[PDB]
Coordinates of C-alpha atoms and ligand atoms in Angstrom, one line a residue:
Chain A
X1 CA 0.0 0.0 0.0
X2 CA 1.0 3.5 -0.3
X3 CA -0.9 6.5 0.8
X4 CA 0.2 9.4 -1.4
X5 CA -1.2 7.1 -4.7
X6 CA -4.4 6.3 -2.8
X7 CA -5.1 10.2 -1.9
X8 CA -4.5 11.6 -5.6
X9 CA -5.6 8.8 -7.7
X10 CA -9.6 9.0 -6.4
X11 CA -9.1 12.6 -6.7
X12 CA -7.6 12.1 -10.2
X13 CA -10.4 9.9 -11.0
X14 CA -13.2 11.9 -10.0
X15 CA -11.9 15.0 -11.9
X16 CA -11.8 13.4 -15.1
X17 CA -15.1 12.1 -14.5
X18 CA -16.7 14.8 -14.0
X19 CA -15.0 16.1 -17.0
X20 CA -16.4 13.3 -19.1
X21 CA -20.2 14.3 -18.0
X22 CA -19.7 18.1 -18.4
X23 CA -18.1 17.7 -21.7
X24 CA -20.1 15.1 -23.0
X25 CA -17.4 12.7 -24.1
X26 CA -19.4 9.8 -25.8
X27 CA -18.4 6.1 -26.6
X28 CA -17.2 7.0 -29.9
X29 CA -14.5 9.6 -28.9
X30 CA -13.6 7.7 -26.3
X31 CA -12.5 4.8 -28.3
X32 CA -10.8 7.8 -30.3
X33 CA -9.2 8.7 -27.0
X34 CA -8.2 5.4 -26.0
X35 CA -6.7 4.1 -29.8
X36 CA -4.7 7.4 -29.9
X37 CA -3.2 7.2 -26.3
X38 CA -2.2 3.5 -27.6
X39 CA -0.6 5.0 -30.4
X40 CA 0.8 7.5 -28.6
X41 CA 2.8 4.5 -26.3
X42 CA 3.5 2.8 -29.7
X43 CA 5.9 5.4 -31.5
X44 CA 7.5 5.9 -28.1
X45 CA 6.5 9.6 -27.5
X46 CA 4.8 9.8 -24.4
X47 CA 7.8 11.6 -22.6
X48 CA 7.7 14.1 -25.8
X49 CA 3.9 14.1 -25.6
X50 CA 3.5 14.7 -21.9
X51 CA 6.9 17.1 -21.7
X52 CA 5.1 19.8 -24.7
X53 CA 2.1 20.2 -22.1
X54 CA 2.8 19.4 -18.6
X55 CA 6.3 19.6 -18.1
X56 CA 6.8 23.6 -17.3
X57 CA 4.6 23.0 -14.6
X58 CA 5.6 20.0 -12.7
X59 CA 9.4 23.0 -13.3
X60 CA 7.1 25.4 -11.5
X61 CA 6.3 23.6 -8.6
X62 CA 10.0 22.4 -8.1
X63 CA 11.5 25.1 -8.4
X64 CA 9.1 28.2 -7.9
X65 CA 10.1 32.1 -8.8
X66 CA 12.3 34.4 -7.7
X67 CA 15.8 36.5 -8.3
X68 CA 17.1 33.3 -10.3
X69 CA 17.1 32.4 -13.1
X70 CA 14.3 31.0 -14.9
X71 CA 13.4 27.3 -15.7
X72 CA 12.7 25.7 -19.3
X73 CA 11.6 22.3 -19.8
X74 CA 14.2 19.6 -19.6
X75 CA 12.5 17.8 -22.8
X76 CA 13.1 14.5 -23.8
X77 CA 16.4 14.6 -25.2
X78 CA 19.1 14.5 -22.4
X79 CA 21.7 11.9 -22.1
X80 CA 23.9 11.5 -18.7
X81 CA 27.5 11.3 -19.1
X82 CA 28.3 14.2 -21.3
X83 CA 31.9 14.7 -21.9
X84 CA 34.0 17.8 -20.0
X85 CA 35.6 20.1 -22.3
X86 CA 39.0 21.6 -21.0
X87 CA 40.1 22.8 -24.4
X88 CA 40.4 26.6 -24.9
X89 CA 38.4 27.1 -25.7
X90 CA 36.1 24.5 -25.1
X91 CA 33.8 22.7 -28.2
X92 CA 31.1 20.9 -28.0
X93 CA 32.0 17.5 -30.3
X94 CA 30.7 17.8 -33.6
X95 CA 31.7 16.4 -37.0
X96 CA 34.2 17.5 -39.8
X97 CA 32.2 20.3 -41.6
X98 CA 29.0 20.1 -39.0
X99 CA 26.8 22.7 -40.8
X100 CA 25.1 26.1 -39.0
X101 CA 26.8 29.4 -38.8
X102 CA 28.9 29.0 -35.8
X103 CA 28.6 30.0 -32.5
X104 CA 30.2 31.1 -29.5
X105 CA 28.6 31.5 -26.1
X106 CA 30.1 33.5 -22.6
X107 CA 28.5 33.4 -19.5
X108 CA 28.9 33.2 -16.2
X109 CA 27.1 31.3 -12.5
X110 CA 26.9 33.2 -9.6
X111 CA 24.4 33.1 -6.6
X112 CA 22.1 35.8 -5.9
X113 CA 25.1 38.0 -4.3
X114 CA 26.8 37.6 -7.4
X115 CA 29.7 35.5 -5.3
X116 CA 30.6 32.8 -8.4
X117 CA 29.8 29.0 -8.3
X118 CA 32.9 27.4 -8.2
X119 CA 31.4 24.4 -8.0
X120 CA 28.9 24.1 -10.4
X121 CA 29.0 21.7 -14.1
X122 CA 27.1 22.8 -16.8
X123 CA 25.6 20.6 -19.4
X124 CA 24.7 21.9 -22.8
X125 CA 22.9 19.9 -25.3
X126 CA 21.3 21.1 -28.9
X127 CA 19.9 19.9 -32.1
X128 CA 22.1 19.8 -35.6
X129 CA 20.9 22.5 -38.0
X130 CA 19.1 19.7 -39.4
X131 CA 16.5 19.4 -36.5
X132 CA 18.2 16.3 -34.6
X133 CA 19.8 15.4 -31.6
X134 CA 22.0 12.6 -31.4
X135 CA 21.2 9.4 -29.9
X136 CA 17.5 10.6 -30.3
X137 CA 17.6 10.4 -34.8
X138 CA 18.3 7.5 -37.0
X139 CA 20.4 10.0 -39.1
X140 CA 22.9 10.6 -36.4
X141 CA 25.1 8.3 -34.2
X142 CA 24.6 7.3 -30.9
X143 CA 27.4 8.9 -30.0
X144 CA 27.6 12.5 -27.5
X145 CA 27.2 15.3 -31.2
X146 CA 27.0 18.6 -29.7
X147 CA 26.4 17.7 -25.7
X148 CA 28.9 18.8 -23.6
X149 CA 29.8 19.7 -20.0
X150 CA 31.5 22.9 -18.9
X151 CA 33.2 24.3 -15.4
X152 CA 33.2 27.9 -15.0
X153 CA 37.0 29.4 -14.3
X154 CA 37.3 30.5 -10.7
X155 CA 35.8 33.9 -11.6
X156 CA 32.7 32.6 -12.6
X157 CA 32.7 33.1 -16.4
X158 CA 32.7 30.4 -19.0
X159 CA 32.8 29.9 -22.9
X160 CA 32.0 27.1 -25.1
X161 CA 32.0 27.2 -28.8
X162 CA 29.1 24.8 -31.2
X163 CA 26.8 25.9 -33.8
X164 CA 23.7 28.1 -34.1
X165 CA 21.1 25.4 -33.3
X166 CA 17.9 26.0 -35.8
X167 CA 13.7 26.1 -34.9
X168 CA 13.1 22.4 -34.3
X169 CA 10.3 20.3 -35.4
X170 CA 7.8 17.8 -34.2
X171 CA 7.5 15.0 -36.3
X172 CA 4.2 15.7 -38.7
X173 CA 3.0 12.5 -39.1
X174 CA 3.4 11.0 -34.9
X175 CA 0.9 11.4 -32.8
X176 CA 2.1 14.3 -30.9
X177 CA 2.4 16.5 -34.5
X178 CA -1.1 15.0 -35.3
X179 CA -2.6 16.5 -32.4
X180 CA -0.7 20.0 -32.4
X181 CA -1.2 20.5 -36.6
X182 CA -4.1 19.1 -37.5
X183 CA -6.6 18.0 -34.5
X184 CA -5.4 21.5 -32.8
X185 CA -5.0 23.3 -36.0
X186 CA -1.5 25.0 -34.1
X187 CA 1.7 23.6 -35.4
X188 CA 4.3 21.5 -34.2
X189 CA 7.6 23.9 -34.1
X190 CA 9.8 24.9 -31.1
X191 CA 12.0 28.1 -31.6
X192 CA 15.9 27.6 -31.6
X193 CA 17.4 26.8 -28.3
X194 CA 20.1 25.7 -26.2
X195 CA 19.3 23.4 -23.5
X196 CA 21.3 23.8 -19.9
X197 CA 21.3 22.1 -17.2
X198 CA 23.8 23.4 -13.4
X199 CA 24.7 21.5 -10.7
X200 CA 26.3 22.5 -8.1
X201 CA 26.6 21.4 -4.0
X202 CA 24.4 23.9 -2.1
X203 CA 22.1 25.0 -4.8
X204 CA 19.2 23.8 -6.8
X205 CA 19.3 22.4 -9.9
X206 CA 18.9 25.2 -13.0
X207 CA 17.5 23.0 -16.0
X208 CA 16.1 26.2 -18.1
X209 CA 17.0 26.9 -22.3
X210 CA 18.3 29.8 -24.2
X211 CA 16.4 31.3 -26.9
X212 CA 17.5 33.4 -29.9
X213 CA 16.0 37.3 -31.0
X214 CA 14.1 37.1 -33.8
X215 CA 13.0 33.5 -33.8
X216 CA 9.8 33.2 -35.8
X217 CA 8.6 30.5 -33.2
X218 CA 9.2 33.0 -30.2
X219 CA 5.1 33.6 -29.5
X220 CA 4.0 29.9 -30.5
X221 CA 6.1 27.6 -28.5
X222 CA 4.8 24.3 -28.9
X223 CA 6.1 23.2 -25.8
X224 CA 4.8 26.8 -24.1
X225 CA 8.6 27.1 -22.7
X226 CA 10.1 30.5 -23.9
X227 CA 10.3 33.6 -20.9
X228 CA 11.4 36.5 -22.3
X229 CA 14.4 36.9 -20.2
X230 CA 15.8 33.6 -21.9
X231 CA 16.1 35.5 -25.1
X232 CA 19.2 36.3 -26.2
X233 CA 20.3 39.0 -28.8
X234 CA 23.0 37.7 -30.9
X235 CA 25.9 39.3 -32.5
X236 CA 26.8 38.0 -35.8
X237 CA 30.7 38.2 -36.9
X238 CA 32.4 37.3 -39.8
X239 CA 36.1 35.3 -40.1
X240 CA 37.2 33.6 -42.5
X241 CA 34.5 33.3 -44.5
X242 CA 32.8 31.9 -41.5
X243 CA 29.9 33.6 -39.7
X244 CA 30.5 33.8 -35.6
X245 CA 26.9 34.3 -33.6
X246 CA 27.8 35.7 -30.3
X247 CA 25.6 35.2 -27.6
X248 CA 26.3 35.9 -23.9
X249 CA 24.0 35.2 -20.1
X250 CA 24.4 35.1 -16.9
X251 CA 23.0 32.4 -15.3
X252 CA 22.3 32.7 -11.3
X253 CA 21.2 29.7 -9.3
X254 CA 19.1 29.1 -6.5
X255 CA 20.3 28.5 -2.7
X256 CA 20.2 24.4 -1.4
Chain B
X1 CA -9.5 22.1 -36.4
X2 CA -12.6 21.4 -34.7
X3 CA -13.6 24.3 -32.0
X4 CA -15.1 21.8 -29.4
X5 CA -12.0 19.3 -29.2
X6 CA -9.6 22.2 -29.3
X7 CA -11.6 24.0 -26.2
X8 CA -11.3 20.7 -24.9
X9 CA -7.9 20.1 -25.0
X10 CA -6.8 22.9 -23.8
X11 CA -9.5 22.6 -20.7
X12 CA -8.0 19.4 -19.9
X13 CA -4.6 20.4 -20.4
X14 CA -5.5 23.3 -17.5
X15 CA -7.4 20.5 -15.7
X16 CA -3.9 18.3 -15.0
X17 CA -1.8 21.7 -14.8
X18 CA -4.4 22.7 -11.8
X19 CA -4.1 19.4 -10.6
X20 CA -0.1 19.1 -10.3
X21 CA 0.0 22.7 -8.7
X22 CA -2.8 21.6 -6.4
X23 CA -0.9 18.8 -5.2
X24 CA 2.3 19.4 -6.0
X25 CA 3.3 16.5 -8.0
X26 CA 7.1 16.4 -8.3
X27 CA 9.8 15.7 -10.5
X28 CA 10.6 12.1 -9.3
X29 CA 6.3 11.6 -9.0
X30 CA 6.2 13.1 -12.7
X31 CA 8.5 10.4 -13.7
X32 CA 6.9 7.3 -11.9
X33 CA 3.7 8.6 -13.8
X34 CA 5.4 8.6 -16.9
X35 CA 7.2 5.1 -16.8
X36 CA 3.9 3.8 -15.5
X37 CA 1.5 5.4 -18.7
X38 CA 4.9 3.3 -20.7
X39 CA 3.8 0.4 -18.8
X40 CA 0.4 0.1 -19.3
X41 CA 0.8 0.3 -23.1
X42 CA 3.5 -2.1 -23.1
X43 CA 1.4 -4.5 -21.6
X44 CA -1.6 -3.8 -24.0
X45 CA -3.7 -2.6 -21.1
X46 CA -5.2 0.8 -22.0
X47 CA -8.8 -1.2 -23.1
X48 CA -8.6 -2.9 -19.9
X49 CA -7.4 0.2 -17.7
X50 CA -9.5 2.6 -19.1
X51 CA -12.8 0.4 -19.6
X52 CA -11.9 0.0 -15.6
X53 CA -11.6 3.2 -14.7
X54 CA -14.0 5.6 -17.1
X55 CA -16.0 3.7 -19.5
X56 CA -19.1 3.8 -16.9
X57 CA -19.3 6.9 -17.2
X58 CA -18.7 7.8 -20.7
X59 CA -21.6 4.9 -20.8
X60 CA -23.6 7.1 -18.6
X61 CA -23.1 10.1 -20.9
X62 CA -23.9 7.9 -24.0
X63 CA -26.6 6.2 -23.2
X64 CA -28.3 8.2 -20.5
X65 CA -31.1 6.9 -17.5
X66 CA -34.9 6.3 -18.3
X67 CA -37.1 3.4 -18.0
X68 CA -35.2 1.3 -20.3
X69 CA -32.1 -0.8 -19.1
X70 CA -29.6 0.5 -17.1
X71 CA -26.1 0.4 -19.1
X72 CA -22.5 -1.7 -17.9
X73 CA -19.5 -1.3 -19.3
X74 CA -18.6 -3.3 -22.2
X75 CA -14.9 -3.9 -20.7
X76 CA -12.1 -5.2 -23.1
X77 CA -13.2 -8.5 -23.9
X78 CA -16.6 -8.5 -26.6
X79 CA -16.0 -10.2 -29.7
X80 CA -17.6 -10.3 -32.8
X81 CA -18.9 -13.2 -34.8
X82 CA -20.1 -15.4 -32.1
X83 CA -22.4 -17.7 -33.6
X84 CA -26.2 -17.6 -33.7
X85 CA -27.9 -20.3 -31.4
X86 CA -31.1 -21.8 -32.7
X87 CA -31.2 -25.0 -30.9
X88 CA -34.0 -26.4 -28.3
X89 CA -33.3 -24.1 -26.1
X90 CA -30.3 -22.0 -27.0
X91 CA -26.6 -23.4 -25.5
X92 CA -23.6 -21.2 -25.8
X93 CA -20.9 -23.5 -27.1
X94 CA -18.6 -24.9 -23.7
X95 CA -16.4 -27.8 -23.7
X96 CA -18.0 -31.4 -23.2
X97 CA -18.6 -31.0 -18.7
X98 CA -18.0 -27.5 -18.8
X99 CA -17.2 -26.8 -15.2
X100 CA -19.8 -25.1 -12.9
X101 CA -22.8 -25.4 -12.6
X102 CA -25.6 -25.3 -15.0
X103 CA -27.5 -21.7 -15.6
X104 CA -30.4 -21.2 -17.4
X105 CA -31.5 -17.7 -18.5
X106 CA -35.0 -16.7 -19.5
X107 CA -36.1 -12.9 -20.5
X108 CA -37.5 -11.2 -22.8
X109 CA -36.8 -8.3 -25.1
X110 CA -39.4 -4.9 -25.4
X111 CA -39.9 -1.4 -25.9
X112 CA -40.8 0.7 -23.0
X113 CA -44.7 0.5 -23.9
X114 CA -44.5 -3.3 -23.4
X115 CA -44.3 -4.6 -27.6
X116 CA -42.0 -7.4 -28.2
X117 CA -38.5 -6.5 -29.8
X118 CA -38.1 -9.4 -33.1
X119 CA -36.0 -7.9 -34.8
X120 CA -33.3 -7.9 -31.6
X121 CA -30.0 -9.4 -31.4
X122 CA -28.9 -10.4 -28.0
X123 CA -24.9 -11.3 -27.7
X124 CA -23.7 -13.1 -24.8
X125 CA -20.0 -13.8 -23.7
X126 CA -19.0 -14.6 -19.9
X127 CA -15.8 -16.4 -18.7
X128 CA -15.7 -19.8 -17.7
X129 CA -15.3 -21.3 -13.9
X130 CA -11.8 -20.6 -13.6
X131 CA -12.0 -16.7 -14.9
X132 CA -10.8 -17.4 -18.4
X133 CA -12.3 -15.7 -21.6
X134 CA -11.8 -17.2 -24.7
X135 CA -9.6 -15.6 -27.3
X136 CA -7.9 -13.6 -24.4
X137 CA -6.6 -16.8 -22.8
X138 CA -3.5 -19.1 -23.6
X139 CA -5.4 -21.8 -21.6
X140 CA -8.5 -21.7 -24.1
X141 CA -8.1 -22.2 -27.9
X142 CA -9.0 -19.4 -29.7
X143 CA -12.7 -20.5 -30.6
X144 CA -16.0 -19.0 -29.6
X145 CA -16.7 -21.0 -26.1
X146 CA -19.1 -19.1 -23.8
X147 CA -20.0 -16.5 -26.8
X148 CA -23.1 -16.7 -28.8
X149 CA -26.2 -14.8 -30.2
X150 CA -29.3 -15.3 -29.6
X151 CA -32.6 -14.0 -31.3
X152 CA -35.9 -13.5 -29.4
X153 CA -38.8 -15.4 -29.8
X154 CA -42.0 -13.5 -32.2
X155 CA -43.7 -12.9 -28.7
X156 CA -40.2 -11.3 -27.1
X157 CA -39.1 -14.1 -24.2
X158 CA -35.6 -15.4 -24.3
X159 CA -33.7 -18.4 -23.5
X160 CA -30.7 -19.5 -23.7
X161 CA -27.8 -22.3 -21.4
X162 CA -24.6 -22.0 -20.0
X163 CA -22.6 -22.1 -17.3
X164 CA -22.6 -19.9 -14.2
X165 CA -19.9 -17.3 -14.4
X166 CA -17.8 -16.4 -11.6
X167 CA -15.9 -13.8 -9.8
X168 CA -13.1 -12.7 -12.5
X169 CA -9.5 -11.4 -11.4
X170 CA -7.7 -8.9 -13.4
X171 CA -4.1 -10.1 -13.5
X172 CA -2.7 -8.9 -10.2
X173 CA 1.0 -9.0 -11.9
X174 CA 0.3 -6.1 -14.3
X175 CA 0.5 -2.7 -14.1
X176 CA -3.4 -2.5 -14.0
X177 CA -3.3 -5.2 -11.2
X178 CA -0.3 -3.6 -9.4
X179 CA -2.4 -0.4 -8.9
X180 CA -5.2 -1.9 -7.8
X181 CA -3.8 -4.6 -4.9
X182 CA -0.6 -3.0 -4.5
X183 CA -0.4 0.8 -5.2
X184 CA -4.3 1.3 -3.8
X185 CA -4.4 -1.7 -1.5
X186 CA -7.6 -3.0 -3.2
X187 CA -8.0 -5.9 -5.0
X188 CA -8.4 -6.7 -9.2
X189 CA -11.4 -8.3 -8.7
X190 CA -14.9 -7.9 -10.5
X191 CA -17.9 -10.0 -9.3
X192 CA -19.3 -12.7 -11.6
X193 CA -21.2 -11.2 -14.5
X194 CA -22.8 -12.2 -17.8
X195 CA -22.1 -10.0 -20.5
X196 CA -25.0 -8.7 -22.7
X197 CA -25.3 -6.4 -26.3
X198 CA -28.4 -6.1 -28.2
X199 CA -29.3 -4.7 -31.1
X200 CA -32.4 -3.5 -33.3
X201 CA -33.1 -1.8 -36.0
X202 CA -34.8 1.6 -34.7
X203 CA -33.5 0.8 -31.1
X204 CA -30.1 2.1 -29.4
X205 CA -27.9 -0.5 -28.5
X206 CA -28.0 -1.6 -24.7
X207 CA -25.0 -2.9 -23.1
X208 CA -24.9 -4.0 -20.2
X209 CA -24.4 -6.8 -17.4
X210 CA -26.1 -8.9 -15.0
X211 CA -24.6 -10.1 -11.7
X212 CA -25.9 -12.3 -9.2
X213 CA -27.3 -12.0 -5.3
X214 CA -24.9 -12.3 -2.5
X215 CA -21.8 -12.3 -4.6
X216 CA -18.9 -11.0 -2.3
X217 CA -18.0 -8.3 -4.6
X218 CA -21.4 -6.3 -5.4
X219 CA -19.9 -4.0 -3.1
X220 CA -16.2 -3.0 -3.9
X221 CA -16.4 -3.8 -8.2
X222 CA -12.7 -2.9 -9.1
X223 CA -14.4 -1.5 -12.2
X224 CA -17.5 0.3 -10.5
X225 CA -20.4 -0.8 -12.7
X226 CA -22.4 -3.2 -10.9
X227 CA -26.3 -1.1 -10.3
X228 CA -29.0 -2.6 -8.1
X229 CA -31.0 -3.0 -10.8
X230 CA -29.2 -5.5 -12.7
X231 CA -28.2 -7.9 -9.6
X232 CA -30.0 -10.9 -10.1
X233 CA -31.7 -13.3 -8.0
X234 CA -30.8 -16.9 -8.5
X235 CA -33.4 -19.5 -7.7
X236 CA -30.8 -22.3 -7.5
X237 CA -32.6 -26.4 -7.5
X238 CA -31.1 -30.0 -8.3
X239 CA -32.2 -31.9 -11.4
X240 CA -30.5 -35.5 -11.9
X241 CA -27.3 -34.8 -9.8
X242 CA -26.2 -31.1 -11.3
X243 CA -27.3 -28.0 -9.7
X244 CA -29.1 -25.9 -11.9
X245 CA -29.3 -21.7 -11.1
X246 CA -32.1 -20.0 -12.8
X247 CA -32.1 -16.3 -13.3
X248 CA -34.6 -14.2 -14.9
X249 CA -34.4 -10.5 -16.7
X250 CA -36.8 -8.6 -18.7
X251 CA -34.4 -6.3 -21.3
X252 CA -36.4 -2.8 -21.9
X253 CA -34.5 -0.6 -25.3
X254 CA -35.1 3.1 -26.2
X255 CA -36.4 4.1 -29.8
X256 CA -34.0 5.7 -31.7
Ligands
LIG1 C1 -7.4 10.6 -19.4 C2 -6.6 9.3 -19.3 C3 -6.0 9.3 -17.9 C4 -4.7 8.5 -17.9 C5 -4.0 8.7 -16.6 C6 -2.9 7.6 -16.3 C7 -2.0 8.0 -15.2 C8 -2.3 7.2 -13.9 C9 -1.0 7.1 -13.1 C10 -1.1 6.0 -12.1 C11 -0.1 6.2 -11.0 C12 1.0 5.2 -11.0 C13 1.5 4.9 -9.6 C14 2.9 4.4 -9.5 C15 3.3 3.9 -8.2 C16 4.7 3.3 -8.3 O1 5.1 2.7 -9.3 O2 5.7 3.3 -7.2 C17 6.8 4.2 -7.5 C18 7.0 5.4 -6.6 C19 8.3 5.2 -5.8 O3 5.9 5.6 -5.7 C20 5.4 7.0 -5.6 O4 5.3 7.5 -4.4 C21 5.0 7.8 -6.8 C22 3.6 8.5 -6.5 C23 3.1 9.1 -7.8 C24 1.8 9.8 -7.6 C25 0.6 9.1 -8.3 C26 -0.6 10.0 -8.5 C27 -1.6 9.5 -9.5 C28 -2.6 10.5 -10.0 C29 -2.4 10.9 -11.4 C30 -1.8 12.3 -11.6 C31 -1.9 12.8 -13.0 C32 -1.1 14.2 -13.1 C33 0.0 14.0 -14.1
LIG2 C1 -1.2 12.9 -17.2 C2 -2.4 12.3 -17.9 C3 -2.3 12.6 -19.4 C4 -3.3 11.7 -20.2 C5 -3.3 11.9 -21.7 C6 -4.7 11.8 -22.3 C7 -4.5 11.7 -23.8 C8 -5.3 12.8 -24.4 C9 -5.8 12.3 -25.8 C10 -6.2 13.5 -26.7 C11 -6.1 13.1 -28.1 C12 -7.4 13.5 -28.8 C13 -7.8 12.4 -29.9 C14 -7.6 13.0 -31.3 C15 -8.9 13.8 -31.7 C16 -9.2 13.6 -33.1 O1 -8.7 12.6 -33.8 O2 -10.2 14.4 -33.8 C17 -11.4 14.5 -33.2 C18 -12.4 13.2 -33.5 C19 -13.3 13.6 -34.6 O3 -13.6 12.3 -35.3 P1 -12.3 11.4 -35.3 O4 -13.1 12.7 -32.3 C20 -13.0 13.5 -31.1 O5 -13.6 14.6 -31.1 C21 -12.4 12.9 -29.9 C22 -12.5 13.9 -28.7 C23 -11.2 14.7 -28.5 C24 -11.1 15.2 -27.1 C25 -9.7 15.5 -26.6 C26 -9.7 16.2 -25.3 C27 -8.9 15.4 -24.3 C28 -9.8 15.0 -23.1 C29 -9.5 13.6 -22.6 C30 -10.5 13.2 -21.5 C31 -10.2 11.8 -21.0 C32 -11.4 10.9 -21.2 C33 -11.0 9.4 -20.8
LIG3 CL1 20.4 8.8 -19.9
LIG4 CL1 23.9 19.7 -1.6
LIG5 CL1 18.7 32.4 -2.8
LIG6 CL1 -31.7 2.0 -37.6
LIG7 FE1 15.2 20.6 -27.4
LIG8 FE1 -16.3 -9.3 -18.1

């Protein structure tokens, strides 16, 4: 037996029932229901499913508001054991010619004080500019493409270099796209973004993402997980032929 | 895009965002949930956890309350096909000694002004003595035993053989079993119950059930759709050796 289960499933329960009778669900859009949440389980998207719509908030109640920065969903895609970059500077791993217009990030973790957090690792993990992750896409190896951890220098700052990640989209033709173009007549698109994840002993976990200016996506998040301080302006370079996007935020974490 | 199913989604989707607030449903509890909706759909058991769970009341909704016959679920087991029964009277097919005792049902099928219902369709189906439906069994062939259709008489009355069912455990090693004895501290099981659909031209269907006096589990139904008025009394006699129970129901449908 356990209790916490027992208290919110009956409560649980008698919410969607009462949801059934006031929105007068009938047999034949319940077998609707029922054959799309199997086909949902079936193409192995019910962590992308339920992250897009309920995800933010389960954030919100973990980590509530303040002086710190703000959460983003953690999504679907991270993988544990990124490796630590040392180089200088450091790069996430990426292949010979990766496409995108590169792009360098600075930064820096410090508590609410501003006293920097020695102590913390930072994870970073984006999509190709081709709209895949690795491990996660038949298309790419299962191998650590453009995940990475980084330790801020005893100052506080850091730097890491990749490319510009690109506005990502939803499969079409799964169940989750199904439901977000066509049953909800939305779409299925996220705007560009970094995902980032700090650790660190004596603070809270930041999981949050870092969004680009000028993103066409910006206002229609699929995943409802852009706050506007998470939007960076970029400052595009050229050398060597090669266009540098320059982006730069402070990140300040949250005390325990 | 539909306006109804989009107002509905996105009251739903506010519905579980309320709820995870409310309660506040964390991280690791988001994740159990998750791993657990995986489960359920690994096993194949979103007909049988769903049917448990809602389909009363989406029954309720469809079908309504009036003077005609109350509505049960029609849970994850009704097959199509069975075969019609014409003989003198009407035996669903069973294995030669069958075990259980012997049940004879008599009825009839009518309108709600008392005029007899020929052109009706009644389907049967029930498990056997040791909780086993056929075609959802490895312990049965794959062959309509305990399923059939019968067809009323021109002045409505009914009559058909069997078997008496008996009580009927869902699995307690699956993940709808593991909620219900372990996570909830219940029990899986559902009292004994006959299974009945029938169908006329000009008539909504009726589905629904009839269970039997002073079963142990009227009261606590792990799938909540036993109603007074379809508990049957058994009038229970010896004729050469075998016990016979007799039950008795008078089927009312609504005009379309
Ligand atoms: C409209 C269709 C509805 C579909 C809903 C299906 C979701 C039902 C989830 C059933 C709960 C699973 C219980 C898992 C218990 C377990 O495996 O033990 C692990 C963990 C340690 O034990 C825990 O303490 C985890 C407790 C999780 C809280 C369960 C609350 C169920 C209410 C549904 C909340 C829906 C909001 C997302
Ligand atoms: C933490 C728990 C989360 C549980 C997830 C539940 C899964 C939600 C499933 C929503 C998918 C909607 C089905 C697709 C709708 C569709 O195909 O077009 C509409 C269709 C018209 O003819 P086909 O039929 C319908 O209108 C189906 C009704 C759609 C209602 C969706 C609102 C969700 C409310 C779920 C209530 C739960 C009842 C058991
Ligand atoms: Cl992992
Ligand atoms: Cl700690
Ligand atoms: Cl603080
Ligand atoms: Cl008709
Ligand atoms: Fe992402
Ligand atoms: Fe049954």
């Amino acid at each position: 037996a356990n209790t916490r289960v027992i208290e919110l499933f009956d409560e649980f329960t008698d919410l969607i029932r009462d949801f059934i009778v006031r929105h007068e669900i009938t047999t034949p859009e319940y077998e609707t229901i029922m054959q799309y949440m199997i086909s949902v389980g079936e193409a192995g998207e019910w962590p992308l499913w339920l992250d897009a719509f309920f995800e933010t908030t389960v954030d919100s109640v973990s980590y509530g508001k303040g002086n710190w920065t703000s959460s983003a969903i953690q999504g679907p895609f991270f993988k544990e054991g990124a490796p630590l970059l040392t180089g200088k500077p450091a790069t996430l791993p990426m292949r010979a010619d990766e496409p995108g217009d590169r792009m360098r990030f600075t930064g820096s973790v410090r508590d609410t004080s501003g006293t920097p957090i020695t102590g913390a690792v930072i994870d970073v993990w984006h999509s190709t500019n081709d709209g895949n992750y690795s491990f996660f896409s038949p298309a790419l190896p299962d191998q650590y493409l453009l995940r990475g951890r980084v330790v801020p220098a005893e100052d506080g700052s850091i730097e890491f270099h990749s490319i510009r990640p690109v506005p990502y989209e939803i499969p079409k033709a799964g169940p989750t796209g199904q439901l977000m173009n066509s049953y909800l007549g939305r779409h299925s698109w996220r705007p560009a973004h970094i995902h980032i994840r700090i650790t660190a002993d004596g603070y809270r976990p930041l999981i949050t993402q870092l969004y680009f200016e000028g993103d066409p996506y910006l206002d229609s998040d699929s995943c409802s997980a852009v706050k506007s301080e998470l939007v960076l302006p970029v400052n595009k370079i050229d050398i060597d032929g090669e266009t540098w996007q320059l982006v730069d935020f402070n990140f300040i974490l949250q005390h325990n």
